[PDB]
Design a protein around this ligand. Structure first.
Ligand SMILES: *[C@@H]1O[C@H](CO)[C@@H](O)[C@H](O)[C@H]1NC(C)=O
Ligand SMILES: *[C@@H]1O[C@H](CO)[C@@H](O)[C@H](O)[C@H]1NC(C)=O
Ligand SMILES: *[C@@H]1O[C@H](CO)[C@@H](O)[C@H](O)[C@H]1NC(C)=O
Ligand SMILES: *[C@@H]1O[C@H](CO)[C@@H](O)[C@H](O)[C@H]1NC(C)=O
Length: 377
């Protein structure tokens, strides 16, 4: 026998669909209207030059300074398919191409161990463009799904979260009563958690990140990346990083985590500061999840730590690297150790040397660890 499993993805980590009835478009070749939803992430054909402007216009969030909230562009809806199922987190591209293969290797393994897609293993995908403050309905659905799985399969559930999904899961758990967690949660397996933010968010917001895909201009994709509240939510936090650490250096100014207001002014994106204020307090830095926790973190992969700009903000910086998994800085991942003394439930730390941030989900060592958590001694 084996416990039910809920999978929580990270940023970019599940499909998104859009349906359009737009008053205006940025190019004539952009569709104003669709009769049904289509996949907006991940579909590679939408990211090609010129067409990418259509995509940005649909997938960007609009920040409303009055409500301090995001909304979709006029005539655009974006929905999250596959809640309670696994397809939309197994493959980011519904063509099922390897370029989008995310949770697929892990789900294959789980199924080989006796799990059933959509039944005792289920996904909890979400609109990862937002931070928890704008995903209230998702947390209600997550709570309900956990309760359902407990009742159906006769025991508490194991939460398995990747990257930003860990922060989503921690937010969720911090807000549930201890008695609820003791009944319904068996364990939380935390894979590549950026507990105190990731340093690369500074570069993304300042100058864009096209991830070495040269056919996408970094200044073009920067528009989308800035619009996503989740980007500013993942700026480094002072419970992980020194308030005096410089993340961004230019010829005339430094930026530390105490300098985000100046940073956002200086990059010409004042809304980002508002988004940071909206989101920075959502997860209490020092409250442990209050459940058995397995913190798995990659090391031995150069991980961007800080950025030097000769020309700010519209040129790519020089990058300084620290330890981590390529994305999540080792320091961030290690916030986990502080929780050992702050909850009664066990906190187990597991280093994964040489395990890159995304590859850790398909890695035999990761899967062997998960198997031990699920299937026992
Ligand atoms: C911003 O939201 C407020 C209501 O909260 C409203 O005044 C206004 O319609 C919104 N702005 C836009 C452009 O939708
Ligand atoms: C920023 O910090 C470095 C030390 O980390 C220093 O050498 C430099 O003078 C600082 N830059 C500015 C513009 O104050
Ligand atoms: C640490 O972080 C929050 C903002 O995220 C701030 O309000 C708090 O006062 C900071 N404390 C420091 C630097 O002592
Ligand atoms: C899988 O992760 C292990 C444990 O860290 C690591 O040693 C090994 O490099 C990884 N294998 C691959 C192909 O990345």
């Amino acid at each position: 026998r084996h416990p039910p499993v809920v999978l929580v993805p990270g940023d970019l980590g599940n499909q998104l669909e859009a349906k359009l009835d737009k008053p205006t478009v940025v190019h004539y070749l952009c569709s104003k209207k669709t009769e049904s939803y289509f996949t907006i992430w991940l579909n590679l054909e939408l990211l090609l030059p010129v067409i990418i402007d259509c995509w940005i216009d649909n997938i960007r969030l609009v920040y409303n300074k009055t409500s301090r909230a995001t909304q979709f562009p006029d005539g655009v809806d974006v929905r999250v398919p596959g809640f309670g199922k696994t397809f939309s987190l197994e493959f980011l591209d519904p063509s099922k191409s390897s370029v989008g293969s995310y949770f697929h290797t892990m789900v294959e393994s789980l199924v080989g161990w006796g799990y059933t897609r959509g039944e005792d293993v289920r996904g909890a995908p979400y609109d990862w463009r937002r931070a928890p403050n704008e995903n209230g309905p998702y947390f209600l659905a997550l709570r309900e799904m956990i309760e359902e799985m407990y009742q159906l399969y006769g025991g508490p559930v194991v939460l398995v979260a990747h990257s930003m999904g860990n922060m989503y899961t921690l937010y969720f758990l911090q807000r549930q009563p201890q008695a609820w967690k003791d009944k319904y949660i068996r364990a939380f397996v935390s894979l590549g958690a950026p507990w105190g933010g990731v340093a690369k968010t500074l570069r993304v917001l300042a100058s864009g990140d096209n991830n070495r895909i040269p056919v996408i201009g970094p200044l073009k994709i920067r528009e989308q990346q800035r619009s996503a509240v989740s980007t500013s939510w993942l700026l480094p936090y002072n419970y992980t990083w020194s308030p005096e650490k410089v993340f961004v250096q230019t010829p005339t100014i430094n930026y530390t985590l105490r300098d985000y207001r100046k940073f956002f002014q200086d990059i010409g994106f004042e809304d980002g500061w508002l988004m940071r204020q909206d989101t920075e307090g959502l997860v209490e830095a020092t409250m442990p999840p209050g459940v058995q926790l397995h913190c798995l973190y990659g090391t031995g992969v150069p991980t961007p730590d800080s950025f030097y700009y000769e020309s700010f903000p519209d040129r790519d910086p020089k990058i300084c690297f620290g330890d981590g998994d390529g994305t999540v800085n080792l320091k961030s991942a290690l916030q986990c150790q502080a929780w050992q003394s702050r909850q009664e439930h066990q906190v187990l730390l597991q280093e994964l040397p040489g395990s890159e941030h995304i590859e850790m989900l398909a890695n035999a060592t990761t899967l062997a660890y998960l198997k031990r958590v699920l299937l026992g001694p």
